[PDB]
Design a protein around this nucleic acid. Structure first.
Ligand SMILES: [Mg+2]
Ligand SMILES: [Mg+2]
Ligand SMILES: [Mg+2]
Ligand SMILES: [Mg+2]
Ligand SMILES: [Mg+2]
Ligand SMILES: [Zn+2]
Lengths: 136, 125, 134, 94, 38
RNA sequence: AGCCAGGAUGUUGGCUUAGAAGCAGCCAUCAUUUAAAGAAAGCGUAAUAGCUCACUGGUCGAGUCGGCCUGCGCGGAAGA
């Protein structure tokens, strides 16, 4: 499962997730899964979806994952008052804004890829689409 | 299915074996297995004959290429064509013994001399 | 109207012959001994297809065909088993003289126009069991 | 040979462009060579079906503006982030 | 009659028909394939 | 779209298995006659047979097929 090996800082500001994405284009494979919706992906989710589309191709071709879950998220446990310090880091997320390209792939027919990214998409919280690489 | 270019190529093929074939009989092929018809392709290749199942509005434009123009009314209903390119006859004898032995189909109206010979009178050929 | 592939000088086992041709109303031992007396001329270790033509009166006429392209390229490539993975693994070589011999046997059995047609179909059963044409 | 039809734009900037895009056109520019750069608009649909063919990128096109043909080549394209649409195009006089 | 929010054609013989403002799947082949949305 | 006809040969392709014969699995997946017929899409047999499908010819006689972008709706939707 994805997670930064070592970070400068342990915990992080909530932030706001705004604007549009960079890397909206297919820079590697022939096909892509683009994020139309807007939100956080947990590491776990990235894992599931990758495993699904890997299943689909019967371990053929090649896959890239263009998003990494670098932002730490925190939670206080149950029966806990406010304050008394910042919550511990439960999991990681990646912040996704509409237009980003999470998954790339090639070495497979169009049809098969449509189906793979579909079955991977089912495991994702954000509304997603299928893009094809364009020259220029 | 067939592209417009395909059908063009085939009007050309059947027209090219048309201008070059002495006798041409048109028949019903219906109700017959690929076994008995592979048998009329063996007795067809052995008798010097050209055996084909071709579309009817395609055979109107292939027959418009003369002098088979009197067969265009034998093109309503299933259509198989025997062109004897080498020899005349040997089609009209083989189709009637095929149609009497199988007890299927017809052998309806044929073409020789530029003329249509009716169902009972292809006993000429 | 049933079709069998039965070893050359052999007949009347229970699992291969008795049930499959005998539940159709056909004599088992008349077929057995008339087919082993007709096919006693087929080489030892060649299954020969026999087409059993059965009638409403239970007396039959059979057309014994020639040993298969598969089994005739089994004996003419010298082999026993063809490839368990055809054209991946090549288990023997049949020269084009043996493709024309097996397609003259199969000229007695085929739909081919010329010996070219039948030798190209036995070419196909030569590539289907993995046997090289040399 | 692709033929694009275009009018010069009378305004510029974010407002003009967003209105232009609402109205199903989009802005483009033609620069390069000796002359001054020309700000034009295009019909979105037309050009979206033309750039649908890779030839569009590697070929010399003809843009008719005010009856006047400029011969150009496709230089660069901004696309809308998640939609199948064209935000803007650079043409260099060819 | 499986009853759920996601209904499909689970073979070639399945048919999508909307009765009384309800989406349905009727099969010729397979009684297991009859579906109601809801 | 629907109705009539065919959907064949080598062949039961090899391997394997008690049997694999299109249709347990593994592999090749060629060629013939062909209008058309995949070493067969599903059901079937102990394995076969058998019933359809892909595909074609006949009939019919003018539109038809599924993607895109969107507007407004449908289901999803159970509480004192
Ligand atoms: Mg940034
Ligand atoms: Mg403003
Ligand atoms: Mg029709
Ligand atoms: Mg509702
Ligand atoms: Mg309720
Ligand atoms: Zn069904």
């Amino acid at each position: 499962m994805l997670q930064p090996k070592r970070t400068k800082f342990r915990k992080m500001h909530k932030g706001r997730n705004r604007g549009l994405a960079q890397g909206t284009d297919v820079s590697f494979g022939s096909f892509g899964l683009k994020a139309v919706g807007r939100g956080r992906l947990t590491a776990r989710q990235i894992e599931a979806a990758r495993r699904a589309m890997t299943r689909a191709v019967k371990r053929q071709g090649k896959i890239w994952i263009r998003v990494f879950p670098d932002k730490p998220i925190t939670e206080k446990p149950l029966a806990v008052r406010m304050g008394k310090g910042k919550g511990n880091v439960e999991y990681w997320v990646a912040l996704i804004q509409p237009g980003k390209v999470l998954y790339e792939m090639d070495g497979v027919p169009e049809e098969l890829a449509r189906e793979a990214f579909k079955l991977a998409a089912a495991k994702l919280p954000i509304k997603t689409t299928f893009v094809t690489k364009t020259v220029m | 299915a067939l592209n417009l270019q395909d059908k063009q190529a085939i009007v050309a093929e059947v027209s090219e074996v048309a201008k070059g074939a002495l006798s041409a009989v048109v028949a019903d092929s219906r109700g017959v297995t690929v076994d008995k018809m592979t048998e009329l392709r063996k007795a067809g290749r052995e008798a010097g004959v050209y055996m084909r199942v071709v579309r009817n509005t395609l055979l109107r434009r292939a027959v418009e290429g003369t002098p088979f123009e009197c067969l265009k009314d034998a093109f309503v209903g299933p259509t198989l064509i025997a062109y004897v390119t080498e020899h005349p006859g040997a089609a009209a004898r083989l189709f009637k013994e095929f149609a009497k032995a199988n007890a299927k189909f017809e052998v309806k109206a044929a073409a020789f001399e530029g003329e249509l010979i009716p169902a009972s009178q292809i006993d000429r050929l | 109207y049933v079709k069998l592939q039965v070893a050359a000088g052999m007949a009347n086992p229970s699992p291969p012959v008795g049930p499959a041709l005998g539940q159709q109303g056909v004599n088992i031992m008349e077929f057995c001994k008339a087919f082993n007396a007709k096919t006693d001329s087929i080489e030892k270790g060649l299954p020969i297809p026999v087409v059993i033509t059965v009638y409403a009166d239970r007396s039959f006429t059979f057309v014994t065909k020639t040993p298969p392209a598969a089994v005739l390229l089994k004996k003419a490539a010298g082999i026993k088993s063809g490839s368990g993975k055809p054209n991946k693994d090549k288990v023997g070589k049949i020269s084009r003289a043996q493709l024309q011999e097996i397609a003259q046997t199969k000229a007695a059995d085929m739909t081919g126009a010329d010996i070219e047609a039948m030798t190209r179909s036995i070419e196909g059963t030569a590539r289907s069991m993995g046997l090289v044409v040399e | 040979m692709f033929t694009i039809n275009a009018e010069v734009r009378k305004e510029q900037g974010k407002g003009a462009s967003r209105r232009l895009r609402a109205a199903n056109k989009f802005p483009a520019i033609i620069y390069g060579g000796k002359e001054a750069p020309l700000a034009i608009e295009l019909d979105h649909d037309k050009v979206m079906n033309m750039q649908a063919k890779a030839e569009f990128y590697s070929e010399v096109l003809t843009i008719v503006v005010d009856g006047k043909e400029i011969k150009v080549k496709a230089q660069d394209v901004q696309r809308h982030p998640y939609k199948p649409k064209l935000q803007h195009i650079d043409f260099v006089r060819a | 009659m499986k009853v759920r929010a996601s209904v499909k054609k689970l073979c070639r013989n399945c048919k999508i028909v909307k009765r009384d403002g309800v989406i349905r799947v009727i099969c010729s082949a397979e009684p297991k394939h009859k579906q109601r949305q809801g």
